[PDB]
Symmetry: D2
Subunit: 333 residues, 4 copies
């Protein structure tokens, strides 16, 4: 399984990183035009949140070197001009943040790539998949797909398990989200005039933000269509975010029973995707945690037999980056 | 109205500051045994969040000097030993955090103080009052009372207005809360071994926390008893906190109607307590805002006609501090 | 004195705000093409550091409205086209960061501006001035000038006084610097690929940075040319930076005497530019302090009678912005 | 070597951790009365900076269990009451911060411990030892020693190398120091009324601080007595600090040569203690680096052939904790 990476940013680089540890998938090419090979290597060797790269990194003959493996590096603004074909790339991890329609992402297909995974929710009707939730509903005919957002990957397993046993009538979600590259260090104009709040100083603000993440749950779980939505607060934190789902349940239950059901899934049919802790955890405890969702039993509570607050952690960078690789293997195999 | 301050902390010093800009109330006496007079002045003079004290601040003969006015300074650990009576104190602002029961707080009365306000939720059944909400129900025969928490002061006005018109069936609250003095700069043991998470690094964590702030709305508004509770996440922010109320209503509404109902309350009955904004605000926009609650119209949303997320901001330090003075004025006059 | 502003960023907007107060200078025109008018009002009305604009900000018919005062707003990329002459502009504040040569800035003269001040050090041999130091050496024939950097404005007053009285033989400088717009919220590529370190996450890092600011003190004080240089460390701080000057003196001295000579200057001829304190201050105490440099007596020390560490604070945004105005007024009168 | 730990804080817990990977040293007993067993397991297991403990941490029958190995846990305020003798403790890591005196530390010897290491500079005459610089001078008859400060362990190796080769005429230091447990989350009164600035908000401030770490280098390298001193600035950073030495040299040198000397020291006699890099590094890159000092070639510079600014990083927590073990093993074998 040969992977290509378009946009060697936080997601691009950590996807590269997770892929090094996996035997079944291999990175063969990278593209980023805001980055010379000298600069690119620097940014990969050092990382402020996840530590240094697990082995030596040099460049040679326009390639990137990780032991006995060469990796092509390109610097093209236009995806139609990236030579994926010559590297026999099976899947392109589209992680720039600006090619989020079927039309724009199909430019990768023109360059010789077989299939594409947007590392974000699409702006159009592109099919969305969450590993562990609806990934088996994929078929090889779909060449361009989305792996949703980190928040959707955190929310979907939690909702699926609660909905199958108890039945979610309606739910509203809040995610307290770690910092992202779309934000600014000092009050300034946000990109293209959209989302003014995200241009406000990241270091000292709680910043309200819209998200479709919870509304997207209805795409990967049709049954919950129109039954979920939410908002986000961005806060000055390196990585790790948390979802807080307030939902009303059809079948009544104590909080103890809800927790045990989530424990059952995390230990059985959702091992590796959904996790369960009863510890007094805080955000830094999930730095570099590869799961999509870790239910925090003690943070949440119940108002009554039918109204619950359910709390789940996620490393927005690491968890998600591992899911891109899982999906990339799945669609190719 | 002659005020005394026990515990010259974040609340004590900002209570002193607010009272400096009011003619109807003045601080005559201060007690803090963990603070010598030179130290006290220094801490009053400078402030990391709210700037330098708007005044020449000095001391002489054991008195604090704010312009042409002398303030009495004490340093007893036992409140019983503070000569409040000789300073002719009408109300004592109990802002130490360690005298939150009617038995402990009554020693101020034994020191001569006529009345006491607990600047926090009580640990017993001491009466709780929130300006704008139930302060007219105060009986002068009550010598010791509590002004609740900053979070309750934010949530109750919001909940009141919404419940008066639409009726709240149930509700769960999250507050994303700024930093407080019970937290630690690096990972350590929390005082008494209680609330382990709050001992974790304040600078780099999202920290789950319990709170009775929502349950206690039921005390100030009996009609909502058993219908509200919540949780909190602490974040590395200087001041300003935000409440997210997910509530289910009986009378259906569009989001715009709910917003309008809050607007008219804010410009009418609850003017000065509850505020309204449709601007793209972030937390630092409410530093030194003296309102108890500021509804953020564009940050909230509705899922359907009976299920809402309503967002409100508060300067947990400065808002609450002015509330302590309005309650001090009320229970005296 | 009619001022125009090119680039409405941190320095652009803060010059604007500084000017609003003063009765001897006024902003008549603004230009910034990465900013729609509605968005410009938003950035002007709210500030994460210096609080809400002390006045109603609106717009109508393409004009910025401050109360009832109309300010003209353009969105041009070629300063030649900005109609400065139409607005009778005496000085243009060049605060984009990308017109720092004589060739580039002189497009403002062809647009009708009478003179230009660069809000940064120049790339070429454009004359540099610092108020209090060498501003009297400016002659009216010079149409394009520079106000240097915030750091140079901090150091040069301190440098002049120490060298005037004692004689600086050599010296080296570290500034610990607040965060600036050239930095990123998460690890990424810095612009143009210059200074890889500045692209590293700003929230969690101490980031070494080059600075010519200390070498630039030679150009404003020829006598010290070759005898000073230094480096910088960027830290997660909103505003306020500190200079730390290690230096050797020709004539020997005690720390007290050095300190008293700075006190004499700060309360005498350099009043308003160089300040002095013996208080136990921290960076937040100089937020919105309009002086160029404030010497911190207790923070510095001597090793011997010829070798000293001298410490001085500066709000790198506010002090500098006010300096820009002083220069503008000076060069016009 | 059987190690005991009094004070299970940042240094205590990370000393425990480093030992877990060392065969030449083992922890048999811990004392910390501010933290019961359930709480102590939590703090060991989770770490906000260095990640989770790399092992299952549990407890039974009053013992801390790291796998099969049982560790005794006392809760004793009076260090003379700890029964170190019953556990055959060779060395006590005295890392509480409140027993920095021969007389006070010697109460560990009454408990049965053979020897004691102060994890900090002493308040009295106690012998200081930096590994790699002066440790070989230790005599087995000295039962109580100090391992100096993180800052001194960073500057000493550098100063040694520079002085041996070029001759340090005089020097002044500045350290930018990561956050420490003596600071406060919000403006407050520091312990004992000492160091007022350390009580100011850790999250939002650059905070000046005194330090004898530079002067103490003259104690471990007598040739440098009276030639070094300096100051510190605290910044909102989890761990990793930097030293900035401005020094005059007796023999003139090109900066390239000064770097080359440090390189061969780091690859030869000071391998493991003193490090060297030419990479564009930032503070986060040295998290969990076990060296005491990492020279940063590109950060520093020279003013002339005699006057240099030399820059070096250190993980104040992890580097130091590793040196405590080295000293413990050395004073026992
Ligand atoms: N970081 C997260 O928490 C997170 C989680 C899940 C999904 N995502 C999504 O992944 C995407 C990338 O996010 P990120 O956080 O890595 O942002 P980022 O800014 O760190 O990375 C984007 C990278 O793409 C590069 N790029 C820009 N234009 C390009 C072009 N024309 N061609 C090729 N490369 C280009 C940039 O130089 C940059 O390195 C976004 O859509 C984001 O929403 C982010
Ligand atoms: N800061 C907020 O966001 C906020 C908002 C609302 C309510 N409160 C409440 O107000 C109370 C104080 O909060 P704070 O943040 O100001 O805490 P703080 O640490 O800033 O202040 C507590 C002060 O009490 C003093 N003190 C301790 N023991 C004392 C005693 N024995 N006698 C006299 N003084 C003593 C301390 O010296 C300290 O200055 C708490 O109960 C808190 O819940 C805080
Ligand atoms: N903030 C400080 O501490 C400080 C202090 C001293 C000097 N400076 C200098 O002042 C300059 C500006 O810095 P800043 O901090 O305001 O950064 P900033 O990003 O806040 O300001 C730049 C602004 O200029 C605008 N702009 C960019 N290109 C433009 C163009 N070609 N035409 C018109 N407008 C354009 C942008 O919209 C932006 O708002 C820099 O050169 C900086 O070195 C900054
Ligand atoms: N943290 C650093 O960057 C660093 C680096 C070098 C040296 N040091 C030194 O190490 C010492 C400890 O620092 P820290 O950062 O670990 O502080 P810390 O606050 O994290 O740890 C101190 C521990 O001692 C415990 N304690 C208090 N009184 C006690 C008593 N009577 N008996 C037993 N335990 C008691 C506390 O509960 C706490 O857990 C300080 O003197 C400091 O100067 C710290
Ligand atoms: N360079 C900006 C790319 C980008 C755009 C959006 C995000 S998001 O995760 O906030 F949606 C992250 C990064
Ligand atoms: N001195 C610490 C006392 C204290 C105790 C509690 C708080 S709280 O507002 O977080 F509940 C704040 C301060
Ligand atoms: N309990 C606080 C103990 C302590 C005391 C001092 C420090 S210091 O490293 O700043 F000198 C660190 C920790």
């Amino acid at each position: 399984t040969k992977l290509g990476i378009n946009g060697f940013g936080r997601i691009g680089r950590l996807v590269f990183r997770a892929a090094f540890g996996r035997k079944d998938i291999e990175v063969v090419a990278i593209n980023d035009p805001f980055m010379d090979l000298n600069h690119l290597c620097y940014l990969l060797k050092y990382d402020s949140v996840h530590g240094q790269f697990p082995c030596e990194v040099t460049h040679a003959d326009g390639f990137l070197l990780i032991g006995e493996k060469k990796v092509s590096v390109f610097a093209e603004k236009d995806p139609s001009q990236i030579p994926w074909g010559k590297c026999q790339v099976d899947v392109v991890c589209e992680s720039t943040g600006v090619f989020l329609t079927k039309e724009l992402a199909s430019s990768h297909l023109k360059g010789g790539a077989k299939k594409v995974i947007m590392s974000a929710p699409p702006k159009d009707d592109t099919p969305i998949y969450v590993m562990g939730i609806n990934h088996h509903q994929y078929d090889t005919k779909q060449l361009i797909v989305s792996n949703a957002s980190c928040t959707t990957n955190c929310l979907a397993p939690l909702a699926k398990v609660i909905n199958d046993r108890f039945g979610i009538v309606e739910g509203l979600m809040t995610t307290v989200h770690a910092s992202t590259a779309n934000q600014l260090v000092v009050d300034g104009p946000s990109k293209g005039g959209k989302d003014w709040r995200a241009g406000r100083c990241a270091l000292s603000n709680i910043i309200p933000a819209s998200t479709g993440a919870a509304k997207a749950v209805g795409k990967v779980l049709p049954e919950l269509n129109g039954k979920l939505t939410g908002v986000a607060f961005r806060v000055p934190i390196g990585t790790v975010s948390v979802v807080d789902l307030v939902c009303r349940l059809q079948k009544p239950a104590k909080y103890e029973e809800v927790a045990l059901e989530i424990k059952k899934a995390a230990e059985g049919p959702l091992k590796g995707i959904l996790g369960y802790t009863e510890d007094e955890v805080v955000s830094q405890d999930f730095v570099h945690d590869n799961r999509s969702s870790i239910f925090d039993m003690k943070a949440g509570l119940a108002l009554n037999d039918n109204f619950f607050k359910l709390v789940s952690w996620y490393d927005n960078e690491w968890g998600y980056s591992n899911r891109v690789l899982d999906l990339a293997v799945h669609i190719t195999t």
